[PDB]
Amino acid sequence: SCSMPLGMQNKAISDSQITASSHLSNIFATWSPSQARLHLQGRTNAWRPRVSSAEEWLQVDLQKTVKVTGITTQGVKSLLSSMYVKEFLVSSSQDGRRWTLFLQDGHTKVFQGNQDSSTPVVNALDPPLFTRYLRIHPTSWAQHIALRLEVLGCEAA
């Protein structure tokens, strides 16, 4: 049903394929883009931008055209409790330079994301994307932006 994980949880998507607008890093911690993997545990187990604004994004380069049918999101809990993205936008690209915002009924689609730190939330993409690159744009969050992600889809051919 073209809904299988594309490699965030299982590392078929390598660390170098995951980038972001910024990430939170200092002399203690590193919430790197490549930590944005569904169900990841261990230290600093999510992507966090350096500051939480509505201009941040997490990018995945799938390295080939894929039929992308869904996106799964999760937050994270740290010492300062629960952080999660409540709402987000999606954009996509074939070349990584020109980006197309995902729409519903001709208007920007706001996806409803998480309401806690650990439960995964699956969002279908209808119409599906035939694309190489994806960006997640947080627009509402609890405490701070933090994300663990899976991308769902299949090889079109």
Numbering used by the authors: 2173 to 2329
Paste lines from the article.
Factor VIII (fVIII) is an essential cofactor in the intrinsic pathway of the blood coagulation cascade in which activated fVIII (fVIIIa) associates to phosphatidyl-L-serine (PS) presented on the surface of activated platelet membranes. At the PS membrane surface, fVIIIa binds to activated factor IX (fIXa), forming the active intrinsic “tenase” complex which catalyzes factor X activation. Association of fVIIIa to membranes is coordinated by two tandem carboxy-terminal C domains.
Lastly, we determined the X-ray crystal structure of the porcine fVIII C2 domain bound to o-phospho-L-serine, the polar headgroup of PS, which binds to a basic cleft and makes charge-charge contact with R2320. The structure of C2:OPLS complex was determined to 1.3 Å resolution and refined to an Rwork and Rfree of 13.5% and 15.7%, respectively. Analysis of surface electrostatics illustrates how OPLS binds to a positively charged pocket in the C2 domain centered on residue R2320. Real space modeling of the OPLS ligand positions the carboxy end of OPLS 3.2 Å and 3.0 Å from the R2320 guanidino group. The carbon backbone of OPLS extends away from the core of the C2 domain, adjacent to the solvent exposed hydrophobic loops previously demonstrated to be an important determinant for PS membrane binding. A single interaction exists between the Q2213 amide-nitrogen and both carboxyl oxygens of OPLS with additional polar interactions between amide side chains of Q2213 and N2217 at 3.7 Å. The OPLS group is situated between two loops, L2210-G2214 and S2250-S2253, forming noncovalent interactions with Q2213, N2217, S2289, and R2320. Although the structure is high resolution, poor electron density is observed for the two β-hairpin loops, indicating high dynamic character. Two alternative conformations for the 2197–2200 loop were resolved in the final model to account for the flexible nature of these hydrophobic loops.
